[PDB]
Amino acid sequence: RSVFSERTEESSAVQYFQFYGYLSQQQNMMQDYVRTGTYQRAILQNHTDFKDKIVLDVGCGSGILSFFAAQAGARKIYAVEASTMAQHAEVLVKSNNLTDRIVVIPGKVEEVSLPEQVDIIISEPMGYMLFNERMLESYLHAKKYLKPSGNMFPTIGDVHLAPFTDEQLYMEQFTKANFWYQPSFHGVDLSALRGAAVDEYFRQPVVDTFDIRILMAKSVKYTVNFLEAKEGDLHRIEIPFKFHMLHSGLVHGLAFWFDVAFIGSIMTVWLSTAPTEPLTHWYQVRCLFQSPLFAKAGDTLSGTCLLIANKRQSYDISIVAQVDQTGSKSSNLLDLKNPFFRY
Amino acid sequence: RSVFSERTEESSAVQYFQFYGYLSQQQNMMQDYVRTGTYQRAILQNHTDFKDKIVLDVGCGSGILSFFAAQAGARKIYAVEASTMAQHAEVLVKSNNLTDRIVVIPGKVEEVSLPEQVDIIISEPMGYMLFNERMLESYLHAKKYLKPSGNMFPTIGDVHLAPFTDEQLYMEQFTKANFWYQPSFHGVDLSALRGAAVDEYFRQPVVDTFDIRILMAKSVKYTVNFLEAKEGDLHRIEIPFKFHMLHSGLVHGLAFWFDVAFIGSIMTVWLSTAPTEPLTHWYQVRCLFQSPLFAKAGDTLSGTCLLIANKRQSYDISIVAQVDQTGSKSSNLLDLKNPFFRY
Amino acid sequence: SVFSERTEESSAVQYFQFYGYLSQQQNMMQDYVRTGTYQRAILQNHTDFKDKIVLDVGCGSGILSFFAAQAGARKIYAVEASTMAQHAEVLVKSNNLTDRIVVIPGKVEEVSLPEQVDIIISEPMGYMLFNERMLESYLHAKKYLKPSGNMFPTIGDVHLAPFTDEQLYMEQFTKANFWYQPSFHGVDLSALRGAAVDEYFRQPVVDTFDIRILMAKSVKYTVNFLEAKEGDLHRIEIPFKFHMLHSGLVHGLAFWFDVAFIGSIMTVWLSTAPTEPLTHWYQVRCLFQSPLFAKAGDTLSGTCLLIANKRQSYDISIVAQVDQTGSKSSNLLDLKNPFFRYT
Amino acid sequence: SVFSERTEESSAVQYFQFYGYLSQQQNMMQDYVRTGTYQRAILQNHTDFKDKIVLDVGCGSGILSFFAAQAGARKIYAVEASTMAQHAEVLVKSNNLTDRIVVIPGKVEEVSLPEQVDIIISEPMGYMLFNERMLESYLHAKKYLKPSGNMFPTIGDVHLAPFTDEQLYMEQFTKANFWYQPSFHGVDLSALRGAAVDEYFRQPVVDTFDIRILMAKSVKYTVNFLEAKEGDLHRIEIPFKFHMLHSGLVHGLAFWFDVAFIGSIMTVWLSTAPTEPLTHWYQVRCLFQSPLFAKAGDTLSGTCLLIANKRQSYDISIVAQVDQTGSKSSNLLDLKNPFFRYT
Ligand SMILES: NCCCN(CC[C@H](N)C(=O)O)C[C@H]1O[C@@H](n2cnc3c(N)ncnc32)[C@H](O)[C@@H]1O
Ligand SMILES: NCCCN(CC[C@H](N)C(=O)O)C[C@H]1O[C@@H](n2cnc3c(N)ncnc32)[C@H](O)[C@@H]1O
Ligand SMILES: NCCCN(CC[C@H](N)C(=O)O)C[C@H]1O[C@@H](n2cnc3c(N)ncnc32)[C@H](O)[C@@H]1O
Ligand SMILES: NCCCN(CC[C@H](N)C(=O)O)C[C@H]1O[C@@H](n2cnc3c(N)ncnc32)[C@H](O)[C@@H]1O
């Protein structure tokens, strides 16, 4: 009867936590130097926000963030982890002689019991498009243990949206669906499913990186303040947008990336996944329109990106975009849980 | 009234003979050095087939072929031309002091009267894919003026067929038809016409040249013997084919070209539009399948190319192809009258 | 009918066969300036359409009728003579507008319409505005227009300006000089050179150009579609007197056109001028047979006489003289068969 | 049901969600070797299908049922448990086969069939043949097979062979040695290097390889689907005795499989051997924890024990020893989490 079990299908949760039980996946994340190094810089440069403080690390995995908090002088760190990785974290705590300061609490943060309130919560809950995996809600849920005067690292999150043009990517996905147009595949007529196939392929967010010159307008920003937001705020996320087109051409979809800010007492440290910044394991995310929209420089592209949380720990993405001057409209549905990894 | 008028719509004939009434189009054909030079070599190298003979030039245009026949020693050349170019040809006959050997007969070869039977017929009746413009029927119809043992230049014509792979051409035509998939073009849903647009764009034979490495099998040859053929034989041309695939991959359609041979007493001279040979104003022609067929090397691709002559001086092309081992079948109907010039 | 009495059947067949292709409708719909300006003119004057009866002359795909429906018209009669009428009816059904738009297949001069309309919409402009002679169908349709009705477009302005283009003028002789050789494969072609030159100079040149070739502000000839009669377009006499801004040789006259939608809220302009973004009409240039030298400050006076023919086009007669010098030149062009020079 | 009692719910959900994607069906259909061989086997044994009753276990898109229909089958019951069943029904309708193919949505262990069948067709092979445990569904379905009924495929051969691949072996420690560093961002990771090594070696390597890495003739283990029962697949003991053709270090065992369609007219083989063209099954290699040195002429004897688990896969235990030296090696592998190494 936990909020996690009430919002998550068991099949999804089992697969999710088996995935994060593998050391190879921990290694993959740790070897993202931009992520790991920016987190260490955020915590150590703001060491006075940790010195002799009580810390909660939500989803500690291998424990790396808890060790950073220990390096910064934290009095006690409660490292919560639901996967079997919790046992490997304990091994590292002992072999690094930090048993007196890092306490691994196995289980889900929505289901464990902590012995005290904490001064600061640290976590790495960002997925693709920031919101995938629905771990932000576990991060916000954990604020029940946070002191009124407490802080959170990261403190805020910016989602950036921008229209792009990429005929090669659009053609690439259409070529895959063209298989289901065949009138005689080994003598079988498949064309009747051509519609279902296009929908399925264009339902896939494309995870990869791209040249910034494909972006056709200054990005739009949607900000989530983790200190202020509540869990329920992430069940439905409505992001309006109005782009002033800087170039003429076809808009094949919207590109997404995110920044998070660790707003400490000493300085604010940013971790960015923008295409102008060094690449991370989050790359960037692009959602294609089933049909591209034409716009000239000076036109306006308006609409809404609506994310609806589902019980598979992801979101159903509804994107409606409209060229204001012409009424040229594009509606699209995307399944954020199952992206197409193009890199 | 005449054989020509019964098989031809008046509007098509008006446009057709207006077209060839332009000196700029005659210049275009004369500056095809491969064509003009090969005809001259075929006629002069076989000067004995013209020396002191009576000649009929069907569709003399500017009269260039008649001048070649005169150079080869013909006693009398009847040059029949239906467009207003006939008056320009008469100007050239006079300025070249050949009034005693070249007699221009204004009118259609199916309607004019000649004083005598001729020893040899010369003409350039080949269009795109050999048969476009239906001038071969006029060429064969002129045999009513040919002596029993007379000759014809060209004597035979070979149509070559071969499967090709060209995903860029296929996607290019699909991209153009994709326009009619839009659900909101300026607020208007065009998708209901997607089927009709694809059918229209893929009805166009693609006229241009290509690298021979796109061909996936040795070509199949269909021979027309102009000495034996009857004009009626060209109303319905059924070309069966069986290719033995040399390469594995997608077959996007069939490529067409043609060779004509001048079989003379001294030597046989070939005029080829094959992609291995220097380019001509005929280029090559490719008929796309609406959906490509997969075949592995060693498979056989069988079917029929059916050409039905229409009243617009062209052909309706039906291509049915099948991979024998798998039953994968592809069909297409093409309108040879209105091709896509891609060069 | 009025149409059949002014049009040769062969021209009509070719004309409506041409517009029966979705690819030709698409070519015009993809002209963003044209389609976007029409939409802006109709929607920004929504009060001229809301709850009113509309006639769309030559609706083609129906796009303009859909814009009129977007503006709130109660009933739109969409008349189309080509087989595009069947595709238009499909779009009316698939956009759920059978209660508002009625497609009427046939020529506007021949069909029966039940009632008078409040506003007529159409896009009847060709090259130089008048080519295709469709404006006469537009004006003929006013027999269905209420005394207080409106016309969209309301007026049309054709612009004339002198130009200098040494390359364009010399190109005609470079092409015609192909005929000025004494032994083209042993044939003396020189007797036809003059005929070749005349043929090239009779072709208006369709393409665009740098505005810096223009030697004077254009002269404007205005057709008020609300007051004009279709008989006013059979003979169009455009007298001109250019005040030369630059000194040099005038090689001919350049043509473009504007149309204006004069609505209750605002006037919207569609321009094909070389100072504006290119459209599928490009611009048209007609050469003088001999260049005229004109000093800055001189006056270039003359007449451009457009005489309608039964090929749905015009014979163009241009006479020009330099007033200060008396230097005179003329030309007579066939607009039905222009030279497409654009690359 | 029998399925629900051998399968954890979470695994089954993920399993049938995976196969509900048209892109996954397409991936299998585009394996020409697989799809073409199945068609050959069915069509070349038309006498085993003509006017027969057929059961297709896990029809997916229905491709195999359409092959059975092409062979003249009287009635085909196509059973599919994922949402792909709804797409197969759409194809049966669009191919006008509703009189012959009855799609039954559900698990073959749970649905009810209206009659007994003459032959069962299916493609139940996973990696290493047995992965996914779908063969048990194939055998379970024999409760509907008549006493003289047939099975397509009829038998399955698993081939085991020792290999040497120094690079593959070394790659494991290169990856695991990430953890053997004393200050990863100030953290000593070395205590987990052993666990990381164990995790990597527990992964069967899926890719292809040069046949020259094989050190002996393969050993074969045959499953006769006509005679076998579901229970026979829960514990699979494969003893082996290899006679080393080459001297060197044996780093593990390579796996591949064949199936044979034993029909009345001919037997057709589908092979995934490394000597045959590649399929989407590739081959599988299981490394030994410690390599074994063997001289040409020595004997490598041991056992490969496959124990089914409720994640629809197998726990693999391999024990091998060089008979002439007594040098011994083991390994435990989890076939559910393979390393896809192919590039
Ligand atoms: N691409 C996003 C990486 C998130 N990843 C952080 C890894 C750790 N910060 C590191 O770098 O070492 C999630 C980790 O947090 C765990 N996790 C999830 N959700 C709950 C939850 N509700 N309760 C407890 N742990 C969770 C998850 O198992 C897993 O290990
Ligand atoms: N690929 C074919 C085009 C070649 N074109 C010039 C050939 C000439 N030998 C040259 O090289 O200049 C044909 C010419 O033949 C004429 N032509 C057609 N059909 C009848 C016909 N039925 N009767 C008389 N002339 C014809 C046609 O007008 C036209 O000028
Ligand atoms: N550049 C010229 C306009 C092309 N085209 C506009 C199509 C549509 N309105 C749009 O703007 O998208 C004209 C269309 O009108 C038709 N047309 C002609 N003349 C008669 C006529 N006399 N009667 C009926 N229709 C006509 C013609 O076939 C044709 O499709
Ligand atoms: N070794 C690869 C199997 C691929 N695939 C065959 C598809 C189709 N026959 C083809 O050849 O293209 C399995 C398919 O069988 C289904 N399937 C599984 N197990 C049950 C089961 N127990 N009951 C019903 N269907 C099943 C599965 O969902 C899935 O679509």
Swiss-Prot record, chains C, D:
Changing residue 82 to A: Loss of S-adenosyl-L-methionine binding. Loss of protein methyltransferase activity. Localized in the nucleus. Its main location: nucleus. Keywords: Chromatin regulator, Chromosome, Cytoplasm, Isopeptide bond, Methylation, Methyltransferase, Nucleus, Phosphoprotein, S-adenosyl-L-methionine, Transcription, Transcription regulation, Transferase, Ubl conjugation. There is a cross-link at residue 93 (Glycyl lysine isopeptide (Lys-Gly) (interchain with G-Cter in ubiquitin)). Changing residue 94 to E: Abolishes dimerization. One of its GO terms (biological process) is positive regulation of transcription by RNA polymerase II. Changing residue 82 to C/T: Loss of S-adenosyl-L-methionine binding. Loss of protein methyltransferase activity. Methylates (mono- and asymmetric dimethylation) the guanidino nitrogens of arginyl residues in several proteins involved in DNA packaging, transcription regulation, pre-mRNA splicing, and mRNA stability. Recruited to promoters upon gene activation together with histone acetyltransferases from EP300/P300 and p160 families, methylates histone H3 at 'Arg-17' (H3R17me), forming mainly asymmetric dimethylarginine (H3R17me2a), leading to activation of transcription via chromatin remodeling. Homodimer. Interacts with NR1H4. Interacts with SNRPC. Interacts with the C-terminus of NCOA2/GRIP1, NCO3/ACTR and NCOA1/SRC1. Part of a complex consisting of CARM1, EP300/P300 and NCOA2/GRIP1. Interacts with FLII, TP53, myogenic factor MEF2, EP300/P300, TRIM24, CREBBP and CTNNB1. Interacts with RELA. Identified in a complex containing CARM1, TRIM24 and NCOA2/GRIP1. Interacts with NCOA3/SRC3. Interacts with SKP2. Interacts (via PH domain-like fold) with C9orf72. Interacts with PARP1; promoting PARP1 recruimtent to replication forks. This is Histone-arginine methyltransferase CARM1. The chain holds residues 136 to 478 of 608 of the full protein.
